[PDB]
């Protein structure tokens, strides 16, 4: 949300004034603004983000580093050029054959001319070369492994959905990654960093006291269970022990989505790519029950509720336990002076803050009067507006922050006492929740099966999720397949047996990649990563688990058994470890219902939005649809006695309860509002009988 370029605002163009030509990618954006990452709504191109290496000219332009090359000798003098000198000069590529001396190898070299043209210059006129690959791309987009295989649409979706993951309770690091998980975590701020070197004195879950090498000590306080700005947890647990020596600029304490320093936006799950029983139909995803049992995907959500005890014309409000008509049953959680006790679990509709207002004198209905005459309960002139926890929410109560006028705290005018109650729950993963990988392959949870009716391997290990095949070839995102195979390679660990020299694929691999351990972390950078021949070479020798058992052959597939029926599948199926996230589009934030609730003020429609109850807008196109069916009575229903027939609604509710027929609908209310507005504009409007 920092590093964001936004072309709309005051002094800038708005979205209705926005033409189509400003939203494209001009060829001067290369190295100055990422072409991938942009919000996929109605803001495509108006909002962007800076490049990785980009740096701001003092006149407000966007400079970019370049390696200058003199006479075909690539130097190291790094010169920042803005887009004008990017057009003056000529610009080479970083994936070019530099012959270990600054010298190019082949004379015919890719280059960029001024107007975005791409040519083959002879290797003598090249005066600038790029500083690395992945220069064109943003921060978040450079965290996508195998990005160069994916199409730009699904890579765009992946970059916009990688910013939406929620902090899990465990936060395990990804196996296959980029370089940008460590650097873009210690630069993100939410990781406590050892300021100056030294040794650890005292750790806890709350503070770390470092011992600097010269006398001084310093306590790094944590942030435990603080609410974020979108309701998610912000825990910081330490990762150092009491005798460790730290250096300056070291990670000392993981943040929300971090793990031993680097980013962890999700977990590493065993995936398989068959279409299973129609539950993974059209982007839907199934899961094991192991993810629910072992709390693999589980996020802590923290919600802030707030009430103020303000002044009024009749008198003054009061936070207290003397509420009105309410069984001393629900007054068990509340303390002696209002608010609930810390740790008492609440449900939807419970009392949080006992708070009662005066009402005045209103004459009673006679039936209410005689009920008070029979039972002897008094009038109780105060009226109760307590802070009730809203519908469809529950969970524990972490902390109660209370203010007061009596402590002389800063409160606005006419407010006597403020209190905030933090409520928190621990959401399991559930069907309907939104999951996605790092490749734009989103999809809701179709069905959480048990662990036994899940396709397990020959080693009795069940798979954990099952994606669909039909979403792969038509969306052009086989980065998920390359991630899947390389993830299995990194899970099992390889050993290129270089007994008689090095094999032909593995020649230009780096050293200490000739063999690897199980659960060893790997990384491909974005535009210089695992080649496909290298993936076949790693996948060929992928040393067995515990027995002599190569579960995944050279093709990258395996013989799954059906957990439900029992027969083996007749064809081998791709398996592997894919790194998937839990998006912030949970079902519990979306489900909503209304029978009868609050009503709008001027017009008499039901209100709007999940904050209130509200109904869904039965808009104009739906009116056309039900006209086109010819359903006339349901249209009369939905436009009179569900929305605006003010005397009709209570008759409908009464007739439903009494079990009678629904009465005949009357005139809507917004028509009458229209009638009085037209009579206000000096237009004689009248209804004529015959």
């Amino acid at each position: 949300h920092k590093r964001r370029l936004s072309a709309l605002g005051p002094g800038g163009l708005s979205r209705e004034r926005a033409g189509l030509e400003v939203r494209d990618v001009h060829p001067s954006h290369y190295g100055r603004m990422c072409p991938i990452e942009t919000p996929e709504g109605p803001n495509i191109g108006l909002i962007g983000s800076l490049s990785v290496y980009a740096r701001v000219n003092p006149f407000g332009f966007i400079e970019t580093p370049y390696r200058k090359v003199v006479d075909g000798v690539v130097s190291d003098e790094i010169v920042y050029l803005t887009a004008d000198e990017e057009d003056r000069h000529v610009v080479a590529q970083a994936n070019s054959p530099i012959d270990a001396d600054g010298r190019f190898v082949e004379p015919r070299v890719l280059v960029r001319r001024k107007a975005g043209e791409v040519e083959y210059v002879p290797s003598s006129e090249v005066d600038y070369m790029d500083v690395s690959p992945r220069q064109m791309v943003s921060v978040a987009t450079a965290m996508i492994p195998f990005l160069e295989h994916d199409d730009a649409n699904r890579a765009l979706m992946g970059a916009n959905m990688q910013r939406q993951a929620v902090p899990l309770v465990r936060s395990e690091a990804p196996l296959v990654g980029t370089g940008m998980e460590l650097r873009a975590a210690i630069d993100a701020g939410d990781v406590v960093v050892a300021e100056e070197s030294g040794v650890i004195e005292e750790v806890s879950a709350d503070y770390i006291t470092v011992m600097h090498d010269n006398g001084t000590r310093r306590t790094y306080r944590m942030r435990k269970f603080a609410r974020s700005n979108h309701g998610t947890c912000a825990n910081q647990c330490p990762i150092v022990d009491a005798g460790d020596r730290v250096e300056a600029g070291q990670v000392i304490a993981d943040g929300p989505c971090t793990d031993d320093g680097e980013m962890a936006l999700g977990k590493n799950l065993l995936v398989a790519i068959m279409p299973w029983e129609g539950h993974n139909y059209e982007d839907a995803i199934i899961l094991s029950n192991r993810l629910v049992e072992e709390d693999v995907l589980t996020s802590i959500h923290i919600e802030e509720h707030e009430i103020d005890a303000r002044d009024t014309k009749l008198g003054a409000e009061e936070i207290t336990r003397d509420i009105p008509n309410i069984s001393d049953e629900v007054l068990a959680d509340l303390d002696e002076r209002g608010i609930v006790r810390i740790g008492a679990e609440v449900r939807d509709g419970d009392i949080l803050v006992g708070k009662v207002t005066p009402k005045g004198e209103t004459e009673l209905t006679p039936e209410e009067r005689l009920l008070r005459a029979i039972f002897g309960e008094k009038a109780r002139e105060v009226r109760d507006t307590s802070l009730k926890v809203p519908h469809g929410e529950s969970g524990k109560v972490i902390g109660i922050r209370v203010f007061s006028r009596e402590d002389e705290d800063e409160l606005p005018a006419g407010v006597n006492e403020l209190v905030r109650v933090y409520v928190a729950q621990k959401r399991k993963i559930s069907d309907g929740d939104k999951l996605a990988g790092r490749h734009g392959n989103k999809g809701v949870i179709g069905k959480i099966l048990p662990v036994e009716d899940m396709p397990f391997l020959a080693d009795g290990t069940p798979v954990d999720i099952i994606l669909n095949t039909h979403g792969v070839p038509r969306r052009m995102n086989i980065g998920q397949i390359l991630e899947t195979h390389l993830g299995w390679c990194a899970h099992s660990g390889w050993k290129v047996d270089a007994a008689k020299g090095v094999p032909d694929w593995a020649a230009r691999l780096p050293d200490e990649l000739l063999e690897a351990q199980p659960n060893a972390i790997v990384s491909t950078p974005v535009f210089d990563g695992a080649q496909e021949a290298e993936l076949q070479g790693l996948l060929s020798c992928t040393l067995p688990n515990r027995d002599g058992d190569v579960l995944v052959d050279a093709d990258g597939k395996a013989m799954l058994f059906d957990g439900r029926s029992g027969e083996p599948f007749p064809y081998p199926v791709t398996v592997g470890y894919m790194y998937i996230m839990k998006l912030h589009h949970l079902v519990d934030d979306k489900i909503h219902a209304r029978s009868t609730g609050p009503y709008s003020m001027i017009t008499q429609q039901p209100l709007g939005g999940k904050a209130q109850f509200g109904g869904q807008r039965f808009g104009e196109m739906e009116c056309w649809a039900m006209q086109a069916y010819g359903a006339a009575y349901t249209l009369q229903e939905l436009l009179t006695i569900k929305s605006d027939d003010t005397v009709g609604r209570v008759k409908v509710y009464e007739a439903i309860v009494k079990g009678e027929n629904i009465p005949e609908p009357g005139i809507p209310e917004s028509f009458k509002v229209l009638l009085k507005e037209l009579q206000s504009l000096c237009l004689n409007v009248e209804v004529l009988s015959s």
Partner: peptide, 27 residues
Amino acid sequence: NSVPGAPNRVSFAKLREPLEVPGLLDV
């Protein structure tokens, strides 16, 4: 590397970058 308590994550990078990633909040 150049970050002291980093995890050991092996890279497939065939090239070498001269310039480090800058101070990502400088803007």
